[PDB]
Write an enzyme that holds these catalytic residues in place. Sequence first.
Site, PDB file in Angstrom:
ATOM      1  CD  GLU A  84      -2.806   1.007   2.539  1.00 11.32           C
ATOM      2  OE1 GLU A  84      -2.233   0.626   3.580  1.00 11.32           O
ATOM      3  OE2 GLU A  84      -4.017   1.348   2.483  1.00 11.32           O
ATOM      4  CE1 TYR A  86      -3.053   6.087   1.898  1.00 10.66           C
ATOM      5  CE2 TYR A  86      -1.443   4.639   2.903  1.00 10.66           C
ATOM      6  CZ  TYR A  86      -2.756   4.982   2.655  1.00 10.66           C
ATOM      7  OH  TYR A  86      -3.772   4.195   3.155  1.00 10.66           O
ATOM      8  CD  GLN A 134       0.636   2.461   5.660  1.00  4.13           C
ATOM      9  OE1 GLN A 134       1.206   2.910   6.660  1.00  4.13           O
ATOM     10  NE2 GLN A 134      -0.662   2.173   5.643  1.00  4.13           N
ATOM     11  CD  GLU A 175      -6.927   9.134   6.773  1.00  6.45           C
ATOM     12  OE1 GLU A 175      -6.871  10.377   6.918  1.00  6.45           O
ATOM     13  OE2 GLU A 175      -6.669   8.363   7.730  1.00  6.45           O
TER      14      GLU A 175
END
Lengths: 188, 188
Positions: A84, A86, A134, A175
Amino acid sequence: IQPGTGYNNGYFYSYWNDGHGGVTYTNGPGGQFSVNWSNSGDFVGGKGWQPGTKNKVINFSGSYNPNGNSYLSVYGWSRNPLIEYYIVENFGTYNPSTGATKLGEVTSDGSVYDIYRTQRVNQPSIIGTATFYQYWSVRRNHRSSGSVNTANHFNAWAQQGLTLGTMDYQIVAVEGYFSSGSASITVS
Amino acid sequence: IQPGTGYNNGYFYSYWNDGHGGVTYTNGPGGQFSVNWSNSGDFVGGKGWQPGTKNKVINFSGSYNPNGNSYLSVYGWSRNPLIEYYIVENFGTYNPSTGATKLGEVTSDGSVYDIYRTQRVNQPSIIGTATFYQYWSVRRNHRSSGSVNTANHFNAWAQQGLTLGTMDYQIVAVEGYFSSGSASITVS
Protein backbone atom coordinates in the site's frame (compact mmCIF):
# COMPACT_ATOMS: atom_id res chain seq x y z
CA ILE A 1 -22.70 5.90 -2.85
CA GLN A 2 -21.75 3.05 -0.50
CA PRO A 3 -18.24 1.62 -0.03
CA GLY A 4 -17.00 -0.19 -3.10
CA THR A 5 -15.30 0.42 -6.41
CA GLY A 6 -16.39 1.14 -9.95
CA TYR A 7 -16.15 3.62 -12.81
CA ASN A 8 -17.65 7.10 -13.07
CA ASN A 9 -17.44 9.47 -16.05
CA GLY A 10 -14.23 7.90 -17.31
CA TYR A 11 -12.43 7.34 -13.99
CA PHE A 12 -12.00 4.39 -11.66
CA TYR A 13 -13.04 5.16 -8.10
CA SER A 14 -12.60 3.45 -4.73
CA TYR A 15 -14.38 4.34 -1.49
CA TRP A 16 -13.74 2.50 1.78
CA ASN A 17 -14.87 3.17 5.33
CA ASP A 18 -14.85 1.37 8.68
CA GLY A 19 -18.65 1.41 9.08
CA HIS A 20 -18.61 4.15 11.74
CA GLY A 21 -20.85 6.69 10.04
CA GLY A 22 -20.24 10.37 9.40
CA VAL A 23 -18.97 10.47 5.80
CA THR A 24 -20.46 11.13 2.37
CA TYR A 25 -18.43 10.30 -0.75
CA THR A 26 -19.84 11.78 -3.97
CA ASN A 27 -18.78 11.25 -7.55
CA GLY A 28 -19.05 14.36 -9.75
CA PRO A 29 -18.62 15.21 -13.43
CA GLY A 30 -15.47 14.06 -15.23
CA GLY A 31 -12.58 13.53 -12.82
CA GLN A 32 -14.30 15.24 -9.87
CA PHE A 33 -15.24 13.82 -6.52
CA SER A 34 -16.21 15.38 -3.21
CA VAL A 35 -16.12 14.25 0.39
CA ASN A 36 -18.08 15.78 3.27
CA TRP A 37 -17.63 14.40 6.76
CA SER A 38 -18.60 15.15 10.34
CA ASN A 39 -17.45 13.10 13.36
CA SER A 40 -16.38 10.30 11.03
CA GLY A 41 -14.51 7.11 11.66
CA ASP A 42 -11.74 5.95 9.29
CA PHE A 43 -12.35 6.31 5.53
CA VAL A 44 -10.51 6.85 2.24
CA GLY A 45 -11.84 7.48 -1.25
CA GLY A 46 -11.18 9.08 -4.63
CA LYS A 47 -10.76 8.81 -8.39
CA GLY A 48 -8.07 7.60 -10.77
CA TRP A 49 -7.06 4.44 -12.58
CA GLN A 50 -7.25 0.66 -12.39
CA PRO A 51 -4.50 -0.33 -12.95
CA GLY A 52 -2.13 2.52 -12.24
CA THR A 53 1.31 2.67 -13.79
CA LYS A 54 4.85 3.17 -12.56
CA ASN A 55 5.40 6.35 -14.56
CA LYS A 56 2.05 8.16 -14.47
CA VAL A 57 2.02 11.94 -14.11
CA ILE A 58 -1.09 12.68 -12.03
CA ASN A 59 -2.72 16.11 -11.91
CA PHE A 60 -5.09 17.21 -9.16
CA SER A 61 -6.93 20.43 -8.46
CA GLY A 62 -9.42 21.78 -6.00
CA SER A 63 -10.25 22.59 -2.43
CA TYR A 64 -9.28 20.61 0.65
CA ASN A 65 -10.65 21.73 4.03
CA PRO A 66 -10.12 19.14 6.75
CA ASN A 67 -11.01 19.94 10.34
CA GLY A 68 -8.93 17.32 12.13
CA ASN A 69 -7.09 14.18 11.10
CA SER A 70 -7.07 13.78 7.34
CA TYR A 71 -4.76 13.66 4.35
CA LEU A 72 -4.87 14.28 0.58
CA SER A 73 -2.67 11.87 -1.43
CA VAL A 74 -1.92 9.83 -4.46
CA TYR A 75 -2.91 6.43 -3.06
CA GLY A 76 -2.54 2.97 -4.51
CA TRP A 77 -1.53 -0.64 -4.25
CA SER A 78 0.68 -3.20 -5.87
CA ARG A 79 0.36 -7.00 -5.80
CA ASN A 80 3.06 -9.67 -5.48
CA PRO A 81 4.33 -8.29 -3.24
CA LEU A 82 1.31 -6.63 -1.68
CA ILE A 83 2.17 -2.96 -1.00
CA GLU A 84 0.00 0.00 0.00
CA TYR A 85 1.51 3.41 -0.89
CA TYR A 86 0.85 7.10 -0.34
CA ILE A 87 2.31 10.27 -1.88
CA VAL A 88 0.89 12.79 0.58
CA GLU A 89 0.39 16.33 -0.75
CA ASN A 90 -1.39 17.83 2.26
CA PHE A 91 -2.68 16.80 5.69
CA GLY A 92 -4.69 18.08 8.63
CA THR A 93 -3.93 17.97 12.33
CA TYR A 94 -1.73 14.80 12.37
CA ASN A 95 1.28 13.87 10.23
CA PRO A 96 0.35 10.38 8.96
CA SER A 97 4.03 9.30 8.77
CA THR A 98 4.35 9.60 12.56
CA GLY A 99 6.02 6.43 13.84
CA ALA A 100 7.04 5.16 10.36
CA THR A 101 10.71 4.53 9.68
CA LYS A 102 12.34 7.27 7.62
CA LEU A 103 14.38 5.95 4.66
CA GLY A 104 15.44 9.15 2.93
CA GLU A 105 14.38 12.23 0.98
CA VAL A 106 13.42 12.94 -2.63
CA THR A 107 12.81 16.23 -4.44
CA SER A 108 9.91 16.26 -6.87
CA ASP A 109 7.44 18.72 -8.39
CA GLY A 110 8.58 21.73 -6.37
CA SER A 111 9.19 20.24 -2.92
CA VAL A 112 11.35 17.97 -0.83
CA TYR A 113 9.47 14.85 0.34
CA ASP A 114 10.38 12.62 3.27
CA ILE A 115 10.24 8.87 2.51
CA TYR A 116 9.13 6.24 5.04
CA ARG A 117 8.08 2.60 5.39
CA THR A 118 6.11 0.75 8.01
CA GLN A 119 4.43 -2.62 8.38
CA ARG A 120 0.70 -3.25 8.68
CA VAL A 121 -0.07 -6.46 10.59
CA ASN A 122 -3.27 -8.41 9.96
CA GLN A 123 -5.04 -5.36 8.48
CA PRO A 124 -7.65 -4.91 5.71
CA SER A 125 -6.31 -4.87 2.14
CA ILE A 126 -7.34 -5.26 -1.48
CA ILE A 127 -6.91 -9.06 -1.09
CA GLY A 128 -8.37 -9.49 2.40
CA THR A 129 -6.86 -9.35 5.88
CA ALA A 130 -3.07 -9.40 5.49
CA THR A 131 0.35 -8.32 6.69
CA PHE A 132 2.13 -6.00 4.25
CA TYR A 133 4.42 -3.02 3.95
CA GLN A 134 3.21 0.52 3.49
CA TYR A 135 5.35 3.16 1.75
CA TRP A 136 5.07 6.93 2.25
CA SER A 137 6.34 10.05 0.52
CA VAL A 138 5.22 13.14 2.47
CA ARG A 139 5.45 16.56 0.82
CA ARG A 140 7.01 19.31 2.96
CA ASN A 141 5.37 22.16 1.00
CA HIS A 142 1.67 21.40 1.46
CA ARG A 143 -0.75 22.06 -1.40
CA SER A 144 -4.21 21.16 -2.74
CA SER A 145 -3.47 21.37 -6.50
CA GLY A 146 -0.45 20.25 -8.49
CA SER A 147 1.21 17.54 -10.55
CA VAL A 148 2.80 14.36 -9.15
CA ASN A 149 5.43 12.54 -11.20
CA THR A 150 4.95 9.11 -9.61
CA ALA A 151 8.14 7.75 -11.16
CA ASN A 152 10.25 10.03 -8.95
CA HIS A 153 8.67 8.48 -5.86
CA PHE A 154 8.70 4.88 -7.06
CA ASN A 155 12.35 5.23 -8.11
CA ALA A 156 13.42 6.85 -4.81
CA TRP A 157 11.62 4.08 -2.91
CA ALA A 158 13.37 1.44 -5.02
CA GLN A 159 16.76 2.99 -4.15
CA GLN A 160 15.95 2.35 -0.48
CA GLY A 161 15.05 -1.26 -1.17
CA LEU A 162 11.37 -0.53 -1.52
CA THR A 163 10.15 -2.90 -4.22
CA LEU A 164 6.76 -2.56 -5.98
CA GLY A 165 5.06 -5.51 -7.70
CA THR A 166 2.27 -5.54 -10.32
CA MET A 167 0.22 -2.36 -10.09
CA ASP A 168 -3.37 -2.38 -8.84
CA TYR A 169 -5.40 0.83 -8.45
CA GLN A 170 -3.92 4.33 -8.27
CA ILE A 171 -6.12 7.27 -7.24
CA VAL A 172 -6.12 10.76 -5.79
CA ALA A 173 -7.80 10.21 -2.42
CA VAL A 174 -9.07 12.01 0.63
CA GLU A 175 -8.66 10.14 3.92
CA GLY A 176 -10.16 11.04 7.26
CA TYR A 177 -9.77 9.61 10.75
CA PHE A 178 -12.24 10.61 13.49
CA SER A 179 -12.67 14.13 12.18
CA SER A 180 -14.76 16.51 10.07
CA GLY A 181 -14.16 18.26 6.79
CA SER A 182 -15.00 18.98 3.20
CA ALA A 183 -13.08 18.51 -0.05
CA SER A 184 -13.72 18.84 -3.78
CA ILE A 185 -10.99 17.39 -5.96
CA THR A 186 -10.67 16.98 -9.73
CA VAL A 187 -8.24 14.44 -11.15
CA SER A 188 -6.58 14.38 -14.59
CA ILE B 1 47.24 19.28 21.74
CA GLN B 2 46.36 15.70 20.70
CA PRO B 3 42.99 14.03 20.48
CA GLY B 4 41.79 13.17 23.96
CA THR B 5 40.09 14.77 26.92
CA GLY B 6 41.12 16.64 30.02
CA TYR B 7 40.83 19.96 31.82
CA ASN B 8 42.22 23.37 30.91
CA ASN B 9 41.83 26.49 33.04
CA GLY B 10 38.96 24.88 34.95
CA TYR B 11 36.96 23.65 31.93
CA PHE B 12 36.62 20.11 30.67
CA TYR B 13 37.62 19.74 27.02
CA SER B 14 37.26 17.04 24.40
CA TYR B 15 39.04 16.94 21.05
CA TRP B 16 38.51 14.09 18.58
CA ASN B 17 39.52 13.58 14.96
CA ASP B 18 39.48 10.74 12.46
CA GLY B 19 43.27 10.79 11.98
CA HIS B 20 42.95 12.52 8.54
CA GLY B 21 45.19 15.52 9.30
CA GLY B 22 44.60 19.25 8.76
CA VAL B 23 43.28 20.37 12.17
CA THR B 24 44.87 22.38 14.97
CA TYR B 25 42.87 22.60 18.22
CA THR B 26 44.09 25.01 20.90
CA ASN B 27 43.01 25.74 24.46
CA GLY B 28 43.09 29.38 25.59
CA PRO B 29 42.52 31.30 28.85
CA GLY B 30 39.42 30.55 30.91
CA GLY B 31 36.70 29.02 28.77
CA GLN B 32 38.33 29.84 25.43
CA PHE B 33 39.31 27.47 22.67
CA SER B 34 40.18 27.90 19.00
CA VAL B 35 40.23 25.65 15.96
CA ASN B 36 42.00 26.23 12.68
CA TRP B 37 41.61 23.69 9.92
CA SER B 38 42.54 23.12 6.31
CA ASN B 39 41.35 20.21 4.17
CA SER B 40 40.47 18.35 7.35
CA GLY B 41 38.71 15.08 7.80
CA ASP B 42 36.05 14.65 10.48
CA PHE B 43 36.75 16.31 13.86
CA VAL B 44 34.93 17.82 16.82
CA GLY B 45 36.35 19.72 19.80
CA GLY B 46 35.51 22.22 22.53
CA LYS B 47 35.10 23.14 26.19
CA GLY B 48 32.45 22.64 28.83
CA TRP B 49 31.65 20.15 31.58
CA GLN B 50 32.03 16.50 32.59
CA PRO B 51 29.35 15.67 33.56
CA GLY B 52 26.84 18.03 32.04
CA THR B 53 23.45 18.62 33.62
CA LYS B 54 19.85 18.48 32.40
CA ASN B 55 19.15 22.15 33.06
CA LYS B 56 22.45 23.96 32.47
CA VAL B 57 22.28 27.43 30.93
CA ILE B 58 25.33 27.56 28.67
CA ASN B 59 26.78 30.89 27.57
CA PHE B 60 29.11 31.22 24.59
CA SER B 61 30.64 34.03 22.57
CA GLY B 62 33.09 34.52 19.73
CA SER B 63 33.82 34.16 16.05
CA TYR B 64 32.93 31.22 13.80
CA ASN B 65 34.25 31.23 10.21
CA PRO B 66 33.86 27.86 8.52
CA ASN B 67 34.61 27.45 4.83
CA GLY B 68 32.66 24.29 4.06
CA ASN B 69 30.96 21.65 6.13
CA SER B 70 31.02 22.51 9.83
CA TYR B 71 28.75 23.25 12.76
CA LEU B 72 28.85 25.10 16.07
CA SER B 73 26.81 23.44 18.82
CA VAL B 74 26.21 22.40 22.34
CA TYR B 75 27.33 18.77 22.00
CA GLY B 76 27.08 16.00 24.56
CA TRP B 77 26.23 12.45 25.54
CA SER B 78 24.02 10.65 28.04
CA ARG B 79 24.14 7.05 29.25
CA ASN B 80 21.48 4.43 29.92
CA PRO B 81 20.19 4.85 27.34
CA LEU B 82 23.19 5.86 25.26
CA ILE B 83 22.35 9.16 23.47
CA GLU B 84 24.38 11.64 21.44
CA TYR B 85 22.91 15.16 21.12
CA TYR B 86 23.51 18.48 19.35
CA ILE B 87 21.95 21.89 19.83
CA VAL B 88 23.20 23.52 16.64
CA GLU B 89 23.57 27.31 16.79
CA ASN B 90 25.21 27.80 13.38
CA PHE B 91 26.50 25.70 10.48
CA GLY B 92 28.41 26.05 7.20
CA THR B 93 27.59 24.65 3.80
CA TYR B 94 25.47 21.63 4.89
CA ASN B 95 22.51 21.37 7.25
CA PRO B 96 23.49 18.46 9.55
CA SER B 97 19.87 17.41 10.16
CA THR B 98 19.49 16.36 6.51
CA GLY B 99 18.22 12.76 6.48
CA ALA B 100 17.26 12.81 10.17
CA THR B 101 13.63 12.35 11.19
CA LYS B 102 11.93 15.60 12.17
CA LEU B 103 10.22 15.25 15.57
CA GLY B 104 8.84 18.73 16.14
CA GLU B 105 9.82 22.31 16.97
CA VAL B 106 10.76 24.25 20.10
CA THR B 107 11.26 27.95 20.79
CA SER B 108 14.22 28.88 22.97
CA ASP B 109 16.57 31.80 23.53
CA GLY B 110 15.26 33.98 20.72
CA SER B 111 14.66 31.46 17.91
CA VAL B 112 12.57 28.57 16.76
CA TYR B 113 14.54 25.29 16.52
CA ASP B 114 13.61 22.21 14.48
CA ILE B 115 14.19 18.96 16.38
CA TYR B 116 15.16 15.62 14.83
CA ARG B 117 16.50 12.16 15.60
CA THR B 118 18.40 9.54 13.65
CA GLN B 119 19.65 6.05 14.51
CA ARG B 120 23.40 5.51 14.41
CA VAL B 121 24.24 1.87 13.71
CA ASN B 122 27.47 0.33 14.96
CA GLN B 123 29.14 3.75 15.25
CA PRO B 124 31.84 5.04 17.63
CA SER B 125 30.65 6.31 21.00
CA ILE B 126 31.72 7.17 24.53
CA ILE B 127 31.35 3.46 25.42
CA GLY B 128 32.69 1.85 22.21
CA THR B 129 31.05 0.76 18.95
CA ALA B 130 27.29 0.92 19.48
CA THR B 131 23.85 1.48 18.05
CA PHE B 132 22.10 4.52 19.57
CA TYR B 133 19.92 7.50 18.78
CA GLN B 134 21.40 10.90 17.89
CA TYR B 135 19.21 13.92 18.63
CA TRP B 136 19.37 17.32 16.92
CA SER B 137 17.92 20.74 17.66
CA VAL B 138 18.78 23.13 14.85
CA ARG B 139 18.43 26.87 15.37
CA ARG B 140 16.69 28.67 12.50
CA ASN B 141 18.33 32.05 13.30
CA HIS B 142 22.08 31.31 13.10
CA ARG B 143 24.45 32.93 15.58
CA SER B 144 27.89 32.57 17.20
CA SER B 145 27.19 34.08 20.61
CA GLY B 146 24.27 33.56 22.97
CA SER B 147 22.76 31.62 25.83
CA VAL B 148 21.42 28.05 25.48
CA ASN B 149 18.87 26.89 28.03
CA THR B 150 19.50 23.16 27.62
CA ALA B 151 16.33 22.26 29.58
CA ASN B 152 14.13 23.55 26.76
CA HIS B 153 15.82 21.20 24.27
CA PHE B 154 15.91 18.18 26.60
CA ASN B 155 12.22 18.72 27.31
CA ALA B 156 11.35 18.97 23.61
CA TRP B 157 13.31 15.80 22.85
CA ALA B 158 11.71 14.00 25.83
CA GLN B 159 8.25 14.81 24.42
CA GLN B 160 9.30 12.72 21.41
CA GLY B 161 11.04 9.77 23.12
CA LEU B 162 14.30 10.88 24.74
CA THR B 163 15.12 9.66 28.25
CA LEU B 164 18.18 10.81 30.23
CA GLY B 165 19.75 8.14 32.41
CA THR B 166 23.03 9.63 33.55
CA MET B 167 24.68 12.60 31.82
CA ASP B 168 28.16 12.41 30.37
CA TYR B 169 30.08 15.37 28.91
CA GLN B 170 28.47 18.56 27.63
CA ILE B 171 30.56 21.05 25.66
CA VAL B 172 30.36 23.93 23.19
CA ALA B 173 32.04 22.38 20.16
CA VAL B 174 33.23 23.16 16.66
CA GLU B 175 32.82 20.26 14.22
CA GLY B 176 34.20 20.06 10.71
CA TYR B 177 33.91 17.54 7.93
CA PHE B 178 36.25 17.70 4.92
CA SER B 179 36.55 21.48 5.02
CA SER B 180 38.60 24.47 6.16
CA GLY B 181 37.92 27.18 8.67
CA SER B 182 38.73 29.11 11.80
CA ALA B 183 36.85 29.67 15.06
CA SER B 184 37.52 31.20 18.48
CA ILE B 185 34.86 30.52 21.10
CA THR B 186 34.66 31.30 24.82
CA VAL B 187 32.36 29.26 27.07
CA SER B 188 30.95 29.86 30.52
